């Protein structure tokens, strides 16, 4: 039936700034929070302020040298770290900004705290819209991500769960999470993403894991313009087959909103309803679930998406007319929650979708 939802948020998160011209805007987390507060969704969930994750918590995955660098570098001392900046990929995509380490601590704190709550069986769902930074690697920042909160949260879940399923619906391949667990069967990673002349360049259909992890990495490569109809007809059948064969005891879902129509960096054509249908599909399996954020660069649509997905988690119907809120003017000219798809061509033909789904089903038949 209806589930208990715990939500993690720190009011300072919206003040972190990646810099002029950088598309990653932490302010979108504050817009999401304010919109869900104005819809009255706070009366239905337990709201928690995550602790600032320690460097020691982060080193459960990341190297000590990389975390020490993140905790030390500042815009005023960057000139003394030119060597380490190259080594750790700190630059254009992952710039040094004021409070960078504290931003990593809050993003990570929400994911790990949510995983602990799920482990203690004190909640059915835990939500951290500030997390989902799937590109960060053991000793390298990548794609606007510095600390991989998802990997840290999964390591926490693995303390009480034999098998953990990770699903990633961001438009970009979830490479950091896939790499972290590539040789183990204790985590199955499933990523649906744009593939072909697109960042990060990984996530081919043929990347299926290695060693004990062979068949435990799943990648569904897509072309521009995927719509609600096309995405919906492959998502439920794939997730149902993965649940059947893998039988996970906990799930982590990365809800990157850059797969929505009109995203500044994305080229997909999903509506908020089409994106949220993924949450409905996963939630239906009644397993402990950690829901995380990720990309999303047309910030009014990110706030709509994550507000609607929080309502989906709560089994709460909310009106299409937006309530008045601190950022009301950002939602013009319509001031509605739901969005319309564009007229862009869907390059994912029905035959291509079925063919890729059948290739993934062949790989899923290889599980024990
Ligand atoms: C060396 N060249 C730059 C590399 C590249 O194409 N980078 C992507 C990175 C896109 C990252 C997407 C992140 C994500 O949405 O998956 C995400 C965000 C949080 O968690 N996951 C990118 N950077 C930008 C960008 C960076 C700084 C300033 C302006 C920009 F447009 C746009 N797209 C190649
Ligand atoms: Ca993905
Ligand atoms: Ca794996
Ligand atoms: Zn993305």
UniProtKB/Swiss-Prot annotation:
Binds 2 Ca(2+) ions per subunit. Zn(2+) binds at residues 170, 172, 258. Ca(2+) 2 binds at residues 181, 184, 187, 216. One of its GO terms (molecular function) is histone binding. It comes from the Eukaryota. The modification S-nitrosocysteine is found at residues 255, 267. It is found in: Nucleus; Cytoplasm. It is an enzyme of class 3 (hydrolase). S-nitrosylated by GAPDH. In neurons, S-nitrosylation at Cys-255 and Cys-267 does not affect enzyme activity, but induces HDAC2 release from chromatin. This in turn increases acetylation of histones surrounding neurotrophin-dependent gene promoters and promotes their transcription. In embryonic cortical neurons, S-Nitrosylation regulates dendritic growth and branching. One of its GO terms (biological process) is positive regulation of interleukin-1 production. There is a cross-link at residue 68 (Glycyl lysine isopeptide (Lys-Gly) (interchain with G-Cter in SUMO2)). Ca(2+) 1 binds at residues 168, 170, 172, 191-192. Its EC number is 3.5.1.98, 3.5.1.-. Its cofactor is Zn(2+); Ca(2+). The keyword rRNA processing does not apply. Keywords: Acetylation, Biological rhythms, Chromatin regulator, Cytoplasm, Hydrolase, Isopeptide bond, Nucleus, Phosphoprotein, Repressor, S-nitrosylation, Transcription, Transcription regulation, Ubl conjugation. Belongs to the histone deacetylase family. HD type 1 subfamily. Histone deacetylase that catalyzes the deacetylation of lysine residues on the N-terminal part of the core histones (H2A, H2B, H3 and H4). Histone deacetylation gives a tag for epigenetic repression and plays an important role in transcriptional regulation, cell cycle progression and developmental events. Histone deacetylases act via the formation of large multiprotein complexes. Forms transcriptional repressor complexes by associating with MAD, SIN3, YY1 and N-COR. Part of the core histone deacetylase (HDAC) complex composed of HDAC1, HDAC2, RBBP4 and RBBP7, the core complex associates with SIN3, SAP18 and SAP30 to form the SIN3 HDAC complex. Component of the nucleosome remodeling and deacetylase (NuRD) repressor complex, composed of core proteins MTA1, MTA2, MTA3, RBBP4, RBBP7, HDAC1, HDAC2, MBD2, MBD3, and peripherally associated proteins CDK2AP1, CDK2AP2, GATAD2A, GATAD2B, CHD3, CHD4 and CHD5. This is Histone deacetylase 2. It comes from Homo sapiens.
